[PDB]
RNA sequence: UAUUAUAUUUAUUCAUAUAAUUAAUAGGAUAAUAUUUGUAGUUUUUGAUACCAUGAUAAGGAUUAUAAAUUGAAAGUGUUAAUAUCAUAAUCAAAAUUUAUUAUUUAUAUUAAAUAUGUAUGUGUAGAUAAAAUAAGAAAUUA
């Protein structure tokens, strides 16, 4: 326990600098916000890779049978309306009921960050190639 | 404390890096209060319900002479932009003014429009030792 | 409002440096490490990665084994029998004077990494293909086991007189 | 297999040193035995292991027998020889378990944890959905979605 | 009594009705209050003497229909369904000259397009 | 007497995927719910995290809600029945009594004098025996009557 | 299932009988009870920890309700909540104070009844005695600090301070 | 909509694109127009408020 | 436009899990079958006991209110919009004794003390 | 020399304080009578303060061992009692990182009530360091 040294005085013309810096940090933040809203909505609106992990069942099965039949003829329209976002996709599968208890229990789904890739994604590197200038919390393309 | 930045520098001990129970730290220092989120824009560091009324602090409650700064939990309202009146807030070193009015501010609290910890640093509020330690962390050039 | 052409004080400040390295204190290089597997030695990578055999797998195994028995597929049983015969032979009692090396004292302090780093690097170098204390080969006589396919029960019709 | 992520490999001897806690935990050893038995193969090394370890456990609170000093050091060397024998009897087992488990997983259309060999199927370590975008040890780029070891029908 | 028990729920135990009167700062006022609630609760329970309409219902756990009953679910409308399934077989035989896979939605299932 | 895990593991040095050990918020715990609790990556302490996700009391509370859901769910899958509210007259002789509310008296035996001792609470009635009572309007019985097994009949198990 | 909750009025039954919901409204009038209209039917969750004899923590009553979001903020919480009046907070407010005896009686009162006079605090007495001791040897390391300065600056007509050496 | 429930129901019609300035190549927002000067509204306060 | 954004306007009387809007034939397999699958099906609904059937039980609900029953399927719980506890947690009685570690006690009565 | 074993296992990116006046007593219904309802005499002192101003409790394993038995110590770590003779600096919210002395959540599902953290994917990878023989499971190189 030593007596606390006194803090030096503030600065000369640092009040102006702090005002200006915060001022235009805010002005910048307006466009950063505008842009990230644009990005967020563009992502919600655009298609995604299929959410289910095909390495497990009932998904591994050849695309001409089983769950894929159930999807092509009964669920297709809906699955496309929600753009294969993993949350509504999993919910639709619960509500189709012809799988029923399996969706959470036997079936496996891709992890969050992989399931969020844009449809067409070929290489894994894509997760890291999305824009970092934008504040969407990984909800941006 | 080592350096006294206020009176309390004399009264308080740091106790090293000490753990406090969850969400009670004696001093409320909201470093995160401006922390950009597009999707969470209306739920983060704002009212939990959009049907809540604006706080006390958006209203003139009593007979006033006038104020120096308005509180930082005051929420920015279309009139803040339009009326063209002084809107000040107490930040450090002194005060932050909203000078350049934008509708993009509207509906958020000024907590959220004022960056608490600036990327800007005064070299003149720093000891030569402290300046050294800020060069080590790769903040100040030298 | 109206995003300005220039920012006076905004980009003015000193840029934070990129980190040069990873892991503890951001000082670790990217290089090959002890944890790295070798896929060129035997059926198991070495050192072997953790593996969890589950009752689930045991049931799937049972059903596979059954379905295989009923389709009269004897081949995978034979590969499995072979594998087992090769690697399950009884290891030979070591000669006196033969022991695994310990890590020399008075080299590093007892809490130091070097200790583990030695152990790993030793066991990494002795792969099961280097275990000479277990007798595998064509040369090996195997009293406990059947030699080939022709001696197992699904061949029984040829065993008949 | 549910546990898919990249992992840290421990040297065989430290795994064995866990004794009753893991390596010889009864529960675990029994389902190893189940795997072997179901494949129609004697579990001799498991039984050797179980014998050694059973007895380890029984006397685990006793003090070791009193040592008389010898210039020969025959006693010390015989204790050592016995000890490394047992160590090797158990290495063999540990190997068997990793071996057969990988093989059986190959038959069950199971995908192993990241960076793991399955002899007929994935020669270099199998990987999909790692935290790191390349295969860790090849230093080659990983495809999206996760690579498939098995043909599609189930 | 049944009505008394259902009205005062956890306030009965071991066949003793027990009201804890906490409302006022002084014990006197709490015996006033407590006594009042008691007579008000008796007044309402006593309605069971006005006729059956006030006798509280019994709650039975009634099973779903049994396996034996459920078996008939597969014979419901048996005639109509066989007679119909022959026509559907014609529809199927015909549809299967055109396309490789015939969905129930080409046969008896209705799905509204727009 | 369940073997399942009801307690969230205590925070410690980082666990890694090993023989004998898995990460704390690994996808295999609590049926993959741990997603809700997870901060992925090499988290930079100073700048990043979500505090509640490392807090013992908060985390454990969440886990406890999840366990409660599991139990509730299984108790409801366990029901084959509905509660119907039937007027006192029409109900079977065993319910013509007074039936104390739950946790009010001693767990109660249905009919000690007739040698049935079981919770009246958990006694379930067949929809077919209550038919006349529950669907009086219908005329002809909607459910066909249960067929019962003669326990005096000579059948395969009596060795004839 | 998602269903409409339903109620059969006793006049419509082929035996009149008192419907459990009706009874519930009776019970709500008697002990005046807030009926939460938005209470989700799906959310019945007992608190396993305290309500099952299987856990060492078993109190027999639902200690907490298991609702994640629930907060001191909500009107529902406010309506069933214990006010701080006459709780331990009040007890602290009154009995825990710097000189505990000032809780039992006015110091001046006590002093004047017991001793003939008001007595200074021990600390004050210390500074007093010390001044007397050290005024006896050195003089003029001192200062003159009062509450009200006029009495020294214009002293009364008399008052000729004795010269000192 | 926040991401938890209805995120996929967001429309491009929500974006106030006329408010900002975009770069053709990137598809990104470069600048924001000023909001306040030209801003007309018949409702500074809600319609039912007469002061 | 508030009903268009389901997760945005949560009054502080509102409770999870949200209830889905009702659907006409859904209450049992016979009704459903009659309305959607096979439309000449003679039995329009499975026999309805003339007395009241309480579907949530023991819980009493307001009659005429569209409601949900505790979910049997694990997935139904997991994929619904039920939130996790995030801030500090509150109890209407226990808040007066601050935290578990500050356990405020007005009087030192035996914890087993019994009100007469 | 007898009264009996360190060479095992697991770890290491560690940050948080602010907007000046400490000096005294005073009782009420169901009491045998008090307007004491409404009790009114400025002004001679000086230390715990932002400041020199003694005392006192921490942490820190190294040889009194097994039986009916504890693996935490006195040698002193801000706040405490005789040295005074620059100054009101104290939280009742919503706040400004440089400080040796700190175990964070690492890939199926991820922001609902007090407002609550945007950042560092990089071959489990330098140097150097941390902890443990106690309801657990470790066994042989004293002064
Ligand atoms: Mg001291
Ligand atoms: Mg003060």
What is the element layout, followed by pairings?
The structure is cut from a larger assembly and holds nine protein chains of nine kinds.
Chain B (H helix, E strand, L loop, with lengths): L2 E2 L3 H4 L66 H5 L4 E3 L6 E3 L29 H9 L6
Antiparallel strand pairs in B: 2-3
Chain E lengths: L1 H6 L4 E2 L2 E2 L9 H19 L12 E5 L4 H4 L7 H21 L16
Antiparallel strand pairs in E: 1-2
Chain H lengths: L19 E3 L6 E4 L19
Antiparallel strand pairs in H: 1-2
Chain B binds one RNA strand of 143 nucleotides through strand 1, helix 1 and helix 3.
Protein name (chain I): LysM domain-containing protein
Organism (chain I): Trypanosoma brucei brucei (strain 927/4 GUTat10.1)
GO cellular component, one term (chain D): kinetoplast
Summarize the structure.
The structure is cut from a larger assembly and holds nine protein chains of nine kinds. Chain D has 154 residues and is mainly α.
For the biggest sheet of chain D, the summary is: 2 strands, antiparallel
Determine the number of helices of chain D (DSSP H or I, runs of at least 4 residues): 4
Q: Determine the fraction of residues in helical runs of chain D and give it as a percent range.
A: 40-55%
Name the helix and strand elements of chain H from N-terminus to C-terminus, one letter apiece.
EE
Largest sheet of chain H: 2 strands, antiparallel
Strand content of chain H: 5-15%
Offer a few descriptive terms.
part of a larger assembly; 9 chains; A: 141 residues; mainly alpha; D: 154 residues; two-stranded antiparallel sheet; elongated; binds magnesium ion; RNA-binding; ribosome; mitoribosome; translation; Trypanosoma
Could you explain the architecture of this structure?
- The structure is cut from a larger assembly and holds nine protein chains of nine kinds.
- With 142 residues, chain B is largely without helices or strands.
- In chain B, 13% of the residues lie in helices and 6% in strands.
- Chain B has three helices and three strands; from the N terminus they run βααββα.
- In chain B, 14% of the residues are buried.
- Chain D is mainly alpha-helical.
- Chain D has helices at residues 12-16, 26-39, 44-58, 74-107; strands at 116-118, 122-126.
- Helix content of chain F is 16%, strand content 9%.
- Chain F has two helices and four strands; from the N terminus they run αββββα.
- Chain F has helices spanning 56-77, 131-134; strands spanning 82-86, 109-111, 116-119, 124-125.
- A two-stranded antiparallel ribbon of chain F has the order 2-3.
- In chain F, a hairpin with a 4-residue loop joins strand 2 (109-111) and strand 3 (116-119).
- The radius of gyration of chain F is 27 Å and the shape is elongated.
- Chain G has 165 residues and is mostly helical.
- The chains are: A mainly alpha (141), B little secondary structure (142), C mainly alpha (161), D mainly alpha (154), E mainly alpha (114), F alpha+beta (160), G mainly alpha (165), H mainly beta (51), I little secondary structure (116).
- At the C-D interface, helix 1, helix 2 and helix 3 of C face helix 1, helix 2, helix 4 and strand 2 of D.
- Strand 1 (3-4) of chain G pairs antiparallel with strand 2 of chain I, so a sheet runs across the interface.
- The complex binds magnesium ion (2 copies).
- The structure holds one RNA strand of 143 nucleotides.
- Chain C: One of its GO terms (cellular component) is mitochondrial small ribosomal subunit.
- Chain A: One of its GO terms (cellular component) is mitochondrion.
- The PDB classes it as ribosome.
